Ligand binder design. Structure first.
Ligand SMILES: [Mg+2]
Ligand SMILES: [Mg+2]
Ligand SMILES: [Zn+2]
Ligand SMILES: [Zn+2]
Ligand SMILES: [Zn+2]
Ligand SMILES: [Zn+2]
Lengths: 449, 449
């Protein structure tokens, strides 16, 4: 009998100061890896994205929360790993633009085509390309889209919308920013409108604010997008109690969970990094956010409910889960927010892996859209940017640095980064790959045409 | 009949602006990965280290020299990849020190034990631990140590020396900095004296300057370390002609190649990055160093000759090859020097792979000791540090940033980084591992006790 193993434990095996104490392996891995290889078709796919979660963000998060010799039971447990490229294209020239934003990267793994920074679901010629979610739905599979960001944000929107600018959230921004996509100009509609038309079985996230807008044209002109949603049969839910109450989500009663106006709350708080903060200020210990809430579902809860609902479909399902705030907090130069959000994503990955290990036909993939700014530097570092000293689980201090922008927001970077997977077809993430190979790998694993 | 494949081509398959044109894969990878898995013993090991070559350095060098959609025929062709941690230990507390130097990291993979920054071949208690080279030689395998840095430098020294400070290059620095290791105090000697005692079959690099010092005690007291070398039967060689003339290197006539006084010359020139250099200055095109020479062997040449000489030993061989200046040029904030050194290492990795593919029992490993400073940022970036715009092979501009030090030297960083391998036992680099796991993997692969 054949089953696929998840690395149970890759923590340092003992005393890190002694010979062999810092090893993470206990014996040869060949047989274990041979057992992980399967070209059987995947019935399901769970894609987990940590926005801005390059290797440096994973390392910093692990150091702080599990200690240097620790191990994330979710993020570090996928057995097949590689590194992939995520460069975008300059719209005018069609040449590579080395540092992507969240919109062009999302489109690349969701459509299989490179695009310009800011586009959602269209190529450099502004032509629409079908997404993996739309194709899944067309083959009759259940579909889910979960995120801690506004649902109009680049990452979850890329699966359901095709607009020339990521800024075209609702009817008003669209009329002014994406005229050709404007409903009243004959277009498909703003991000939110196209989201409602896409009709995924399960959509959960923040972004309730934009649903307050009213349609400028169409069958539901004059009424709010929230009204249109209920009118078209959506089960609206807005707190954890209600979310747990849901027992079925399907094309007849698709679920829409709006848990916050903008982005859902961050798990941990901490002060922002400051100039010479590692020398001028005391070390920081992060504190849980008192307003994250008992009534606000966490990403792992959302992941669990999404899995429960989507698995009732005998055909199979595609679910994308996004740990959205790693990137946002990285932009904010806030180590605690950033680390808390990676820890949060780890819990959702654990849920996904438990299901997959038991179900056996599920491909789980964990990766990021692009790299980000934070760097782990020596404690006595005198850097030109923003730094902060943190008290880690090891009882030592780790210094983090943000030094790629004099502006207010720290920027993305173009380093290739880790992709890891488990399950049927995971072999296709090993070695060097491109972000658009992700679209083809998932399309082939599910056997879509 | 079973053979293990190297990735032949992972360059973008077509037009990067079109659907599927940016894909690096042409079909399912399962069978190919299954064919790469073997637990057969390794007769030989080739360990290639890019100093400071984290994923960011690899991406920057690929973008510049092969284009974003290109592919390093050496660096990117290894089929089994993972990420590994390299934290060092605080000497006093024994707790993790998140950002390692080159001395503690080389000690970790060459001994299997974590140590403090600055130590070579000793643990935090200053106890000596045998290296993979010393163990290989004890089992009767041929051994080689090749680098473009001074042979007294941390990376190549770690295989043959055990001193409490990496600064103890020769007799004089040792007397004052490593009193306990000083020969005239009864110690084993300075780095260069221990290198002469270790007697690897092939040692090639820079660092002839220190051999001008004279021993303070011992059998060869009063004469230069160069003189001692000839007295002990070493074949001294100092240019490429001489290097090519060598037809055998063994324990009777070990080879010592001193090609420069300090570090061997860098491949490419270019100006240093500067404050607001991507906005204030024109884009840079790197230029081949006129003084890199016809009489100075290149890293690939050194690698070839080392492989020819060490392969005559029927028992097998261990060879470590270091592209040293990637890290050094990264510190200097000089993109061209840094990229040129990465390109240079790629050529050496290609020679090692050709041999391995044909020999069939060689484990080739390519990785770095720690990550470094350089980041690939957006072209319009206003950063607080040093930046520079480069004209890449794609005909687009890529901006590189160094923003983690207000000092003169750019600093190392602690992000986990790529490790890739090919051949028998390569499965042990996949997933998350620690740098000390690498010592154990090599020892097992060669079957050492
Ligand atoms: Mg996002
Ligand atoms: Mg070095
Ligand atoms: Zn992003
Ligand atoms: Zn971002
Ligand atoms: Zn180094
Ligand atoms: Zn260095």
């Amino acid at each position: 009998t054949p089953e696929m193993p998840v690395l149970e434990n890759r923590a340092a095996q003992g005393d890190i100061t002694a010979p062999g104490g810092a090893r993470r392996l206990t014996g040869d891995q060949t047989a274990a890896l041979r057992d992980s290889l399967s070209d059987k078709p995947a019935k399901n796919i769970i894609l987990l994205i940590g926005d801005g979660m390059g290797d440096s963000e994973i390392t910093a998060a692990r150091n702080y929360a599990e200690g240097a010799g620790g191990f994330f039971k979710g993020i570090d447990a996928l057995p097949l790993t590689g590194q992939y490229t995520h460069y975008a294209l300059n719209k005018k020239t069609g040449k590579p633009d080395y540092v992507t934003d969240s919109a062009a990267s999302a489109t690349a793994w969701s459509t299989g085509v490179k695009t310009y920074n800011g586009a959602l679901g269209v190529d450099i010629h502004e032509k629409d390309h079908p997404t993996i979610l739309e194709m899944a739905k067309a083959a009759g599979l259940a579909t889910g889209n979960v995120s801690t960001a506004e649902l109009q944000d680049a990452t979850p929107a890329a699966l359901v919308a095709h607009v020339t600018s990521r800024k075209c959230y609702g009817p008003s921004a669209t009329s002014e920013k994406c005229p050709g996509n404007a409903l009243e100009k004959g277009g498909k509609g703003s991000i939110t409108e196209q989201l409602l038309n896409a009709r995924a079985d399960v959509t959960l996230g923040g972004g309730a604010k934009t649903f307050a807008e009213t349609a400028t044209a169409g069958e539901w002109q004059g009424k709010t997008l929230r009204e249109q949603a209920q009118a078209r049969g959506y089960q609206l839910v807005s707190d954890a109690a209600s979310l747990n109450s849901v027992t079925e989500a399907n094309q007849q009663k698709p679920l829409l969970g709006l848990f916050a106006d903008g982005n859902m709350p961050v798990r941990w708080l901490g002060p922002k990094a400051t100039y010479h903060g590692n020398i001028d200020k005391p070390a920081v210990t992060c504190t849980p956010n008192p307003q994250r809430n008992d009534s606000v579902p966490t990403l792992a809860q959302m992941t669990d409910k999404a899995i429960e609902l989507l698995s009732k479909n005998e055909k199979g399902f595609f679910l994308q889960v996004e740990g959205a705030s790693i990137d946002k907090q990285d932009h904010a130069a806030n180590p605690c927010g950033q680390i808390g959000e990676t820890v949060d994503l780890d819990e959702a990955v654990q849920r996904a892996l438990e299901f997959a290990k038991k179900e056996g036909n599920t491909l789980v993939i964990v990766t990021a859209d692009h790299a980000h700014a934070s760097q782990i530097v020596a404690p006595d570092t005198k850097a030109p940017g923003l730094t902060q000293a943190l008290n880690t689980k090891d009882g030592a201090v780790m210094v983090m640095s943000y030094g790629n922008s004099e502006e207010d927001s720290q920027e993305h970077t173009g380093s290739q980064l880790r992709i890891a997977a488990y399950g049927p077809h995971a072999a296709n993430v090993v070695g060097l790959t491109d972000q658009t190979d992700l679209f083809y790998t998932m399309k082939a694993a599910l056997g879509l045409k």
